[PDB]
Please model this.
Amino acid sequence: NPLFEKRPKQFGIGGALPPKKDLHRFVKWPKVVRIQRQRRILKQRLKVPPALNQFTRTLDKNLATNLFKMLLKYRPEDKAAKKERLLKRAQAEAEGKTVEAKKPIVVKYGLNHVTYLIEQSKAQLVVIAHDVDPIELVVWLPALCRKMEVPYCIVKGKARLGSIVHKKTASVLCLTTVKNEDKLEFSKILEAIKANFNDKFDEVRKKWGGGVMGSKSQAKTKAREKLLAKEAAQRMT
Amino acid sequence: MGRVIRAQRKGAGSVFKSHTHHRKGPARFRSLDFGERNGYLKGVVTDIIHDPGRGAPLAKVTFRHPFRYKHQKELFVAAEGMYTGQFVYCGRRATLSIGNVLPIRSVPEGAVVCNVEHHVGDRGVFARASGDYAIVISHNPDNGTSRIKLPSGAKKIVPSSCRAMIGQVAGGGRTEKPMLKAGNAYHKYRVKRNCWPKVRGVAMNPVEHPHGGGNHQHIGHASTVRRDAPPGQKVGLIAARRTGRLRGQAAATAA
Amino acid sequence: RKSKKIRTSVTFHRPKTLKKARDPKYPRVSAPGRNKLDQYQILKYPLTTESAMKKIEDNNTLVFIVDLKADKKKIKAAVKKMYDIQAKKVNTLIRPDGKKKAYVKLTPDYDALDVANKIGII
Amino acid sequence: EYKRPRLSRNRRTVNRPYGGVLSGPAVRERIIRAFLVEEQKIVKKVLKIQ
RNA sequence: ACGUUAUUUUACUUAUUCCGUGGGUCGGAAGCGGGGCAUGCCCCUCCUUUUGGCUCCAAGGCCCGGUCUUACCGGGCCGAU
RNA sequence: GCCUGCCAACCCUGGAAACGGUUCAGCCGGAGGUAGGGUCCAGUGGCCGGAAGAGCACACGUCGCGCGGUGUCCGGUGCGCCCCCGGCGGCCCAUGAAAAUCCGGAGGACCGAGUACCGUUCACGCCCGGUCGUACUCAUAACCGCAUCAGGUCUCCAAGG
RNA sequence: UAAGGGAAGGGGUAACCCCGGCAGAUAGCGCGAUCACGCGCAUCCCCGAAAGGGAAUCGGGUUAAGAUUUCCCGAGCCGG
Model:
């Protein structure tokens, strides 16, 4: 071959640096990475109270996305948008002498605001974040709604809800009113929660803690297999 | 009561400490990548270097192979019959020859070893002092346990994963033949952490030591004090099972 | 720029190692205060002693008494400014006065004797 | 004296490989070892596969 | 029945605890070798392996090559599951 | 600068029994000696350069804060003395530091040109080298003991009988 | 640089103060590099013998004095 001499060479293993390997699973972590991974796992390990683990049984992606399309109309104002609106109204009322704008319809948001709406029964549907770092805050939200018999839904992503409001954590947002046009497809959303929880209150762990552990699952398979072989062979012969 | 006694002085301080720095380096065992069917980590004995810190040698085994994260080098414990330029193999599937270190499971029953691990990676716990060796007493196909009869005579349950080195440790006979000087004794103790002369408790003052005082030479009370006794109180032959000169034996467990 | 996969892949073929990242800095715009030019005159006067006098003749060297923050570099420049001469060495002596005596070796091209006359020294 | 100085390039070295490092009869011992391992290795490899 | 409640024994991985590192090649599966078991249809329900072996050298440029966008320039993938 | 050291070590010749040389420990030679010829470490001496232009001893001069001239050389001896440096030997349950400083080799990427590009660990030439201490005693009187105290207080040089 | 001392970290101790480093380990120091970008790495980092270890000077002359050292001639040598 005029181009080159030795076409095959073995680097690899038994000489040279190996295939990279899963060092995404090994490496020395910063402290923050260590704690965050453990938290989900430990949710299973400790017995999870009746209020929780009603969570994690979340709304479907298809249902969630079409919900947001309705909310596209209702989106709350930005900092710039609100300031802009004041100038328009001020000009119109003073110079034109026109009677005030139509009543605004938007999602109402924030914990204290929305929870009050559940009590008064003003909110038709509330959309509740799965997340939120003080978990004590958000256990109350489906609990209160269920108690008063106001339909609610739990969707994943506190950030996802927050994007709509153009802020940070919304935690909850809700529709007290809806347009007549949106009303038909809004019915599907109301049905949606009672199409994953048309059930009585499942109060998860009786005493159970665990959820299955990688090492234990492998161990259990081996133990089961040995037992099964022995049992079968007594009947057979 | 009294001024504080000499044992409590260990504490910290350079005066009670030895020159640990002068000592020649780590005694560590290089932590196996995997494999090792003859020469996947190949060491070359290039020297057998005396360690002043225990007055017995560790063989200088030089592993040198590159990469970058390769970890290599330095002193595995010397065994008998080792020579310079002989290759040393460290790991799971290593050949059965003297001076090689491998898991105890793959070593057959009835086989003399030096060093054992009292849980994997602690590098050498059982038999390290000269002319001593453990002999691996039992195994069977036991996944859980390798049983080793120690030089203390104790039969110990230890994991089958734990590494041991074939052979007995070198420099044997060291302690057996007598010093025949006070001055020879001084030099050994100087290099290690010990203060050399032993003043007797009788020879000390009553303030310094419980056994001190009295016009004539004598220990005033019973030497044997309780194990449960607190620090300061606890002197003499602590919790002696018997005394006076006859018919004991080595540590003798039964199973 | 950085598409996150790239950082992950670099760590993937490594057994840990160290770190590496960089980030910028900025100086203010408000003008930190105090504008000054508090400055001492390193050369104060040619020092005059019997032992100074002989050296001018002998070895082409004026002898000055100078500041206590003297060196060799600044004083050589100062001598050049104020008396128009090249200085070949500067030599430093602590005195019991608490100031620094300087022996400053001068050029043979313009003699220390005829430098001396206009800043007279005995 | 032995670093970047009045001395010329030659004085730090001997021309042969491992000039300052190994003695010369020591150098040939490792050339012999290099020779033996390569020739033996092919013989070992073909034997094992068969 | 729902478990409730109380003694002790015993076991798992997450608290805690010990130790190992310039966290390395871990675990599980399958590639590829091949053996033993009844070796029967491979033989799973298993055991060895899985690039390095005498032979004071040496194993570093994630490699030459293969392959694809890509005229060369230059970038991937694979070689090394 | 030129030349030069034996022990240690190494190269080549050669093929040893009537085996040799040889250490304070048996070590050279049987993985090649004794012996012959080389090579290396360059402590050191030599002669030359330095460098007499210096210095030393003389004569003469006041010609003085200094004038003119010479001569200053060649051997020998060792259980001497001191120190160094070399390579050995005794010692040990004692086996007797580390770093700045730092070159080498292996490594071969990358860059190599001709009327120029590459070496630039070479020679020669050009400039520069900052900061601080330097007096002097160092003791029967400059230190410490109230103190010009017979005391004490670390080290180097070490004539002749 | 040593024996050793001591900031930095975590943690006790109100606190003084003491061990002494840590998530400088996918927190940045170091080298190409001028071009903005890439590559590489820890047990750090300073003090610690005016005795250890060590970049590099000799001669003559001189004053009240040590002079390789002050001065000066002549000759170097080291680093940039």
The longest helix of chain A spans residues 214-236. The beta strands of chain A are 108-109, 125-129, 152-155, 172-175. The two ends of chain A are 67 Å apart (CA to CA). Chain A has eight helices and four strands.
